[PDB]
Design a protein around this ligand. Structure first.
Ligand code: P1O
Ligand code: P1O
Ligand code: CA
Ligand code: CA
Ligand code: CA
Ligand code: CA
Lengths: 577, 577
């Protein structure tokens, strides 16, 4: 026990704490010749001469068994008062009062290390790219807002004659009664913002913006040089079925917004606690496997953890986008999934607004609650530690960062990126919310890393790591996902077909009465079905196949055009300075 | 003049020809210490000790101005009789009598050099992969042939009652008279081969096969370690308009096969002479640009030359596939392209058979005529040279390879690959024809390289070069192109919709009368148009939009499924030994 530690200390050669007599901490420094020897064995760069991050790396499992209590570097100074580097970049960068200043990226790679430097460089560059995407999203938001007097469909669903005379079918078995449509008017008014031509121009822009983000980040990186799959499928089913359950336990502006916000909040609570669960089961799964190296361990953990997180966070959104209300048929013979399991018909405006509210609640709530957790949990852990003098004694009573470190940090921003990219065709303010989150996110990551956490050992990484193929896969998936959101989720394509193709005798006015289908009780539900009385009644009509062929042709045209533009831009940008 | 050559020879130090007194050839050898010095300046590998390819590279513009007559290595021996390496791999590899033996790839990199070795390794591995793709293509060809008694549509177009009672519309202005359909029966019978379920399984297989080809070739490479764009657009228009012209100058089994084979032959003749033209204008264009290095010169030449060759060879095929007969409307108001320019309505079986004949003529004729040129042109040039003793005198009178060398060789196989991949859904025997071409292609490239050409200087290349992104782009384009061939070119999707979707009251029998549309003279042309007498007469009907929505959904499903399978296979194959 103590013999192993004494022999290891004698090999390393080859004070106790004033507050706790049982703990003893040994100072570790290197001589000049030994530093030059370790700097020859590890080929460091050249122009007191060795930097403190370089010294702490060159000086850098036995503590995993519990023999050694703690091994760490030491901070330079207290942040609250000057001794003095930590005080400096706390005073001008890490403080929330210095929210507007530029990041001292050379100072952050000086003090913390190039993985922390590359995370904060990626975070700041993400913020600057999100500023461009956010002002274009504000431009398309103004395009939707100022043309609210020209959206003919919202003005005729808000008018009582065209909108109120619908009396559309119930989406629900026990009474849930059939209703005049003008009550969705206050939900439809903002819908003129959320699927107009402005958000289509924004989505086609956002494909290009993701491409520019990736290529100029490649340039900035160039400058700055089997049971678990079955469990994932069970998770895929689980998030959808509790999305249904939270909508049901709610079901037993104001009414629709209360519905969407309340169900989104309670589902988001389940999302967070199931996220902690998924952290634990994925770490148990990758510990059941034997990984040979820590890097292969964290790559496998990155893939499995991100797949569980992808499933957990976006499966509700994918249900609302592509599965909710998409497979329901006519009110005669509704689709009972397993018997007595009638699926949820959507509102006639579409499930885009419900997707929008769920997106902004999950995104902004993960932002708010994750920053609250990132502040408070190390702070309250240090507080209950302090409720139970030398420098290293002060630096001892800090929550250690962990073996992974910045991993979860990257993870949450990648999840934020999946809201910025995969669902950007729903609401254009996703880069704005991401920007206002990221401006504080640099400060909260900075502040907890400076104040609350022990100093992580500096070590260089040439990129973000295994998150880069994840981001490229998210980028390729974003084109398909935005195409299915504009085609399948929103209703922009049916009114596009109504204006361009059926103002003709075989304008935009008269769209709402001409879209829906009348239903015999043996009301006008939202579907394109040949009507009681037509020879092919309740089968899909000519107009269903016209609109769905325009949907599929839009998916093909938009995907091929955007993928060729992404190819032309990745081929045209030299990817170097 | 002679002073520059004398000074260069004196720097190099730092016999005349018996047949021609004006020419003098100096032997060039290196001493042992100078060879070790050049082998230290160029870091050669280690285990008379320096190999002859290595010696010829280490010993290796003034001849471009015309000062030096010729500078070359020397061959080891005459091929016809032993002196003796060249005689050996001529006797057992390069001879056409050794067509069945394996390639001595270590001997070919010993004698010729690693670019020639990697071309012949790529050629042989291409041949072995084509053997697998060819036996699967023969399997789907047997699937189409043995089920010829079960193709209901061909048996009812060959029957006089269902097929002969059509009397379909003329595709032509001056009389070209309307005709009973059973005359396409002998063309439709083999059509039961060419678009059945077997070729669909072959196309979905061929996406996987291209993927396996690319990944195992990555493994084998790992083991074996602005005016011109406007001219390209003018070429794009030019090949299509002379495809129209050769069809017209023909127009002024037996009748349709005579048409297709004759027009394909005369167009292919124009293809070849315009290919020589495109060689010359592309070499003039890349000489008008100043390239800094020979490698950047040949990369730019590779891109421009392949783009011109792509346009030249496949623009006729792309016209037949995606533009011929696709944009023609109903016989009332035909599409005159510029006035008095009625486009060519296709046969009711589709333009797939015309595409098939054009493909096999262009592919097999480029194979035959390119091997005939590859044999004869160096042979006849050496013959007229000989119509006007030491070793170097014999090796002097050979056609030199040129500065590019194997470039055109790679080029033609890449063009062959574009027939193996981009149009594989038309006829499944494309890998078979490629296999029977490649077995002789190794021998003709081997034989002309051994007998007729001067020995190219050995120099190492780690891959095929700039053709590898070209092949990956051809591979990505192949999925889209095969999807548009199965959907848009062939008629497999309309009969798939007829069987699965309209045997119902709103079997495969009755497909031909139910596909076409009747035409009032104010006959049954091949289109899906609402009929004289329907309220929406000659507009597209329900069934057009059903079939074209199934086409577009097939494109989306097939592209996404195949691209995910390609991603799973490229991610699952470790790309290393
Ligand atoms: C890679 C991640 C993204 C995957 C996207 C999944 C797409 C699923 C959407 C889907 O198929 O929905 C079925 C319909 C959508 O048209 P809708 O008119 O919404 O369906 C009827 C609903 N309503 C009458 C009550 C208004 O659509 C169809 O009927 C056509 C089916 C073709 C879909 C193929 C897309 C991608 C395949 C992998
Ligand atoms: C990248 C290299 C490959 C490019 C492929 C180009 C595709 C062009 C094919 C095309 O659009 O043809 C028009 C129709 C095809 O349906 P058809 O029924 O052949 O057209 C009517 C012909 N007929 C009545 C005489 C029998 O199709 C349509 O009407 C739907 C238009 C959507 C096409 C979008 C595909 C790719 C866009 C870049
Ligand atoms: Ca956060
Ligand atoms: Ca963070
Ligand atoms: Ca050839
Ligand atoms: Ca050849």
């Amino acid at each position: 026990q103590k013999r192993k530690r004494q022999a290891y200390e004698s090999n390393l050669i080859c004070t106790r704490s004033v507050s706790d007599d049982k703990l003893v901490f040994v100072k570790v420094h290197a001589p000049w010749e030994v530093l030059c020897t370790y700097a020859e064995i590890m080929h460091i760069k050249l122009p007191s001469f060795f930097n403190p991050a370089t010294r702490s790396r060159i000086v850098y499992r036995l503590v995993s068994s519990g023999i050694y209590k703690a091994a760490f570097p030491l901070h330079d100074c207290r942040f609250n008062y000057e001794s003095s580097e930590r005080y400096l970049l706390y005073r001008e960068w890490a403080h929330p009062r210095s929210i507007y200043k530029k990041q001292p990226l050379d100072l952050i790679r000086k003090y913390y290390g190039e993985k922390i430097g590359i995370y904060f460089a990626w975070l700041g560059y993400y913020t600057q790219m999100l500023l461009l995407a956010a002002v274009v999203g504000v431009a398309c938001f103004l395009y939707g807002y100022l043309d609210q007097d020209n959206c003919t469909w919202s003005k005729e669903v808000c008018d009582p004659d065209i909108g109120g005379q619908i009396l559309m079918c119930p989406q629900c078995d026990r009474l849930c009664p059939f209703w005049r449509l003008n009550i969705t008017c206050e939900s439809s008014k903002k819908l003129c913002i959320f699927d107009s031509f402005g958000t289509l121009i924004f989505a086609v822009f956002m494909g290009v913006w993701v491409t520019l983000f990736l290529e100029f980040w490649k340039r900035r990186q160039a400058e700055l040089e089997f049971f678990w799959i079955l469990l994932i499928i069970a998770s895929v089913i689980g998030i959808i079925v509790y999305r249904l359950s939270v909508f049901i336990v709610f079901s037993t502006l104001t009414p629709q917004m209360a519905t969407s916000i309340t169900a989104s909040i309670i589902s988001f609570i389940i999302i967070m606690i199931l996220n902690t669960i998924y952290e634990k089961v994925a770490i148990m799964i990758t510990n059941f496997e034997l990984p040979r190296t820590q890097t292969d361990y964290e790559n496998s953990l990155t893939m499995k953890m991100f797949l569980f997180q992808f499933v957990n966070y976006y499966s509700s959104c994918f249900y609302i986008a592509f599965f909710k209300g998409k497979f329901v048929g006519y009110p005669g013979d509704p689709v009972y999934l397993l018997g007595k399991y009638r699926s949820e018909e959507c509102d006639p405006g579409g499930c885009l607004l419900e997707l929008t509210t769920q997106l902004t609640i999950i995104m902004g709530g993960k932002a708010i609650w994750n920053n609250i957790q990132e502040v408070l949990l190390p702070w309250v852990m240090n507080l209950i530690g302090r409720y139970k003098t030398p420098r290293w004694e002060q630096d001892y009573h800090l929550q250690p960062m962990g073996k992974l470190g910045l991993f979860y940090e990257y993870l949450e921003m990648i999840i934020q990126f999946g809201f910025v990219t995969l669902f950007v065709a729903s609401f254009p303010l996703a880069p704005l919310l991401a920007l206002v989150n990221n401006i504080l996110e640099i400060r909260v990551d900075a502040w907890k890393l400076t104040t609350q956490f022990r100093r992580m050992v500096p070590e260089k990484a040439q990129d973000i790591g295994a998150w880069q193929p994840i981001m490229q896969g998210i980028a390729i998936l974003a084109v398909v996902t935005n195409a299915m959101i504009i085609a399948f989720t929103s209703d922009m394509i049916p009114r596009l077909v109504y204006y361009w193709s059926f103002s003709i005798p075989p304008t935009m006015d008269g769209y709402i009465n001409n879209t829906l289908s009348v239903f015999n009780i043996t009301c006008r539900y939202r579907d394109f079905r040949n009507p009681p009385g037509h020879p092919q009644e309740y089968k899909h009509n000519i107009y269903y196949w016209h609109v769905i062929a325009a949907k599929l042709a839009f998916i093909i045209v938009m995907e091929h055009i955007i993928y060729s533009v992404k190819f032309f831009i990745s081929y045209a940008i030299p990817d170097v300075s």
